[PDB]
Amino acid sequence: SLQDPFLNALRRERVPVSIYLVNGIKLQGQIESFDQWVILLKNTVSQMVYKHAISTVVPSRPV
Amino acid sequence: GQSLQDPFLNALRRERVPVSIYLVNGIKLQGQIESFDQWVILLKNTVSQMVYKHAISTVVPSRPVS
Amino acid sequence: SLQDPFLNALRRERVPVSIYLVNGIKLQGQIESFDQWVILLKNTVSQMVYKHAISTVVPSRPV
Amino acid sequence: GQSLQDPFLNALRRERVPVSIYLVNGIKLQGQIESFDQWVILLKNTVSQMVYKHAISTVVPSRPVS
Amino acid sequence: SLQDPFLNALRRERVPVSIYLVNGIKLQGQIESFDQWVILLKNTVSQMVYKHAISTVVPSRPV
Amino acid sequence: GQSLQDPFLNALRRERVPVSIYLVNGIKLQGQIESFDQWVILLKNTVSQMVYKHAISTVVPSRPVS
Structure with a gap:
């Protein structure tokens, strides 16, 4: 319901994101693609x- | 008996009550509930x-709802 | 089987509890209500x- | 092949063997297994x-069972 | 598919292992038995x- | 739309690209993907x-695949 439109916007507009993991690690990059189970996040590599x-997907700036 | 999650979150959303959401890593998020479904909550602060x-882990209202 | 009677006793007798979360945070309060997925714990707010x-639900004193 | 959990926990319960239960947060609980079902274990120390x-994460007997 | 042969080899050859848990705790011992949900690891006790x-099951030496 | 995991892991496996696997506890593993199925990945360093x-949490290639 909410997940796909939210990620698809960030992808199609190529908005940089912060992805906070359950281990507290923050990942940064662009959403390259995604499915039901995974997100491909591009920085230097995919x-x-x-x-x-x-835990959370945070846009770096208002979307 | 069933079922508490939706009425609880909808009440916070409709009354625009600021919440603290504690994550399983212990990080605390703050903001207002913009929307939610079965899997995610959209939490608004400066960004959604x-x-x-x-x-x-827990959703803590900053003040009583209703 | 065990969950509902255990929580229902603490609720109906209004026994204060400690709820330890998987993040190590200890919550304290009264069990207000519960279902299959959540517990409403009352302190200052619900x-x-x-x-x-x-992780564990600990009664503050023998129940 | 199937199925190890119930016989393991029942043995500890019936022989009243003190156990250490390590949680996924790394907290160690100690006590005796009072009862259990598919979702929970009731662990008795001063309180149940x-x-x-x-x-x-792991259930560690304080001494050999049987 | 992969799990049972991997554990069965370590069991049948009685190879000592390190089991890293999601809490960062490393357990050491011998794989005594296992099923779909649990592994019995023997050291002083089972x-x-x-x-x-x-998180991971690491053989102490090449298997 | 579906489905990204297998092609991603198969590409790393076939091209023998060294990876870093970050676990939910924050521990970083390093090695090459030897094989995988729906539940596990066999990661080769000195041992499998x-x-x-x-x-x-995340599988990070040490360099671009293809």
């Missing part, structure tokens, strides 16, 4: 982030 | 951030 | 605690 | 506390 | 380790 | 270790 380990 | 419910 | 984030 | 299995 | 709390 | 996906 890394695969499991949604089950994500 | 998407919080996964699986990562939430 | 806060909603997700069971998935609860 | 309800421990969620989803929050348990 | 302890029951929930798979849901395991 | 079995990593549970439920305990993984």
Whole structure:
């Protein structure tokens, strides 16, 4: 319901994000793609982030 | 008996009560509940951030709702 | 099986509890109500605690 | 092959073997297993506390069972 | 698919292992038995380790 | 739309790209992806270790794949 539109906006507008993980680690980058289980976050490389380990997805600026 | 989550969150959303959301890592988020579904809560501060419910430990109202 | 009777006793007898979360945070208060997914714990306000984030529910004194 | 959890916990319960339960936050609980079901273990020390299995990492007997 | 053969080898060859838990605790011992949900790890006693709390199972030496 | 995990991990495995796997406890593992299924990844360094996906937060390639 809410997840896809929220991520799709950030993706299509190529907005930089902060992804806070359940281990307290903050990841930064661009949302490259996503599905039901993972987000591909691009910085220097494309890394695969499991949604089950994500606490919050924060836009760097109002979207 | 069933079912407490939606009425609780809807009340906070409709009355615009500021909340603290404690995450499973111990990080505290603050803001107002903009919207929510079965999996996520949209929490508004300066930006609207998407919080996964699986990562939430407790939702604490800053003051009584209703 | 065990969960509802255990919580219902603490609720109906209005016994103060300590709820330890998976993040190590200890919450204190009265069990106001509960369902399959959440417990409402009352102190100054009613806060909603997700069971998935609860490690243990400890009565403050023998029940 | 299936299924180890119930016989393990029942043995500790019936022989009244003191256990240490390590939680996913690293907190160690100690006591005797009073009862359990599919979701929780009731652990008795001075009080009976309800421990969620989803929050348990390991159950360590203080001494050999049987 | 991969889990059972991997653990069964360590068990049948009685290879000592390190089991890292999601709480950062490292457990050491021999794999005594296992099923879909738990591993019994033997050191001084047999302890029951929930798979849901395991991050990695590391053989102490090449297997 | 569906489905990203297998092609991502298979690419790293086939090109033998060294990866860093960050676990939910914040521990970083390093090695090459030897194999994987729906539940685990076999990560090779000096030894082959079995990593549970439920305990993984992010898989970070050490360099671009393809």
